[PDB]
Amino acid sequence: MYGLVNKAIQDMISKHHGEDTWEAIKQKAGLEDIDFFVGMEAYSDDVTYHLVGAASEVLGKPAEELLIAFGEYWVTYTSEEGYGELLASAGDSLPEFMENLDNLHARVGLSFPQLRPPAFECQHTSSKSMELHYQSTRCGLAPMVLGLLHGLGKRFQTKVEVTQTAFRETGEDHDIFSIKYE
Ligand code: HEM
């Protein structure tokens, strides 16, 4: 994943737990070499998985819990770190934003050549609910999607309830979330 993702994880941890904790995580993750992350540079996906595993051990939180928190954080981090207009352009309500997500990542992918974005498809079931299909080249990031959706709820001052109804882990084709919103 691009350095931007790893910087945001670093930022989230460093802000909540301080630099010493960050340095321990960095060390345990096997990254003491890397002096800083470069936002627009591509890293091995392993860098991100190791950082998360190491943060889990050092902080004593399951990795999935940290992914949820990171998902929520990302919505705020991107708005403040160069992508606030891009976010605004993706809509002014939760359901519209989710319809625009693939288009938003298409736009991101202009600037980030090697992007491997997720694919999201919405099947609306009412004016207050939708099924969200999430497909990815990567494993284990469904909890991050959960936090993202909650971050977007906060963004749009909209109450949202998100329940995953299909899990790749149980052998399903892809993750599916049932979403209800104000
Ligand atoms: C303007 C705001 C955003 C920017 C700049 C951005 C950019 C990125 C970047 C660089 C990656 C890494 C992919 C790679 O390195 O190949 C990524 C991944 C991801 N993004 Fe976005 N993103 C934004 C908003 C969102 C939002 C709002 C969501 C909410 C659903 C989202 C969902 C995801 C997920 C689930 C991944 C994990 C990659 C995967 O599943 O394969 N992104 N995004």
Alpha carbon distances (Å) from 165 to 7, 93, 173? 31, 23, 12
Three-state DSSP state, 160: strand
- By the 8 A CB rule, do 67 and 151 touch? no
CA atoms within 13 A on the CB side of 152: 28
What residues does 43 pair with on adjacent strands? Answer: none
Three-state DSSP state, 147: helix
By C-alpha distance, which of 66, 143, 145, 64 is closest to 98? 145
Q: Is 8 in the pocket of ligand 1 (CB under 6 A)?
A: no
User: Alpha-carbon distance 98 to 168, whole Å?
Assistant: 21
- By the 8 A CB rule, do 176 and 98 touch? no
* Residue 13 phi, psi (nearest 5): -65, -50
Three-state DSSP state, 10: helix
Q: Is 5 in the pocket of ligand 1 (CB under 6 A)?
A: yes
Ligand 1 centroid to residue 117 C-alpha, Å: 6
What does this entry list as its resolution, in Å? 2.1
| Residues with Cβ within 8 Å of residue 114, at least 6 apart in sequence | 2, 42
Question: What architecture does CATH give domain 1-182?
Answer: Alpha-Beta Complex (3.90)
**Ligand 1 atom with minimal separation from the 120 CA:** 30
Q: Indicate which residue's Cα is closest to atom 35 of ligand 1.
A: 145
Which tokens belong to 29? 């993750």
Give me the sign of the Cα torsion angle 57, 61, 62, 65: negative
Ligand 1 centroid to residue 134 C-alpha, Å: 12
**First vs last C-alpha separation in the chain:** 33
Alpha carbon distances (Å) from 54 to 27, 42, 64, 103? 9, 20, 13, 33
| Residues with Cβ within 8 Å of residue 76, at least 6 apart in sequence | 151
Q: Is 49 in the pocket of ligand 1 (CB under 6 A)?
A: no
**In terms of C-beta distances under 8 Å and separation of at least 24 residues, what long-range contacts does 30-35 make, across chains too?**
30/54
The coordinates were experimentally obtained by X-ray
Q: Do β-strands 119-124 and 129-135 pair in parallel, antiparallel, or remain unpaired?
A: antiparallel
Give me the sign of the Cα torsion angle 19, 21, 22, 26: positive
Residue among 9, 104, 162 to mutate when testing ligand 1 (max atoms within 8 A of CB):
104
Q: Do β-strands 160-166 and 119-124 pair in parallel, antiparallel, or remain unpaired?
A: unpaired
Ligand 1 centroid to residue 105 C-alpha, Å: 7
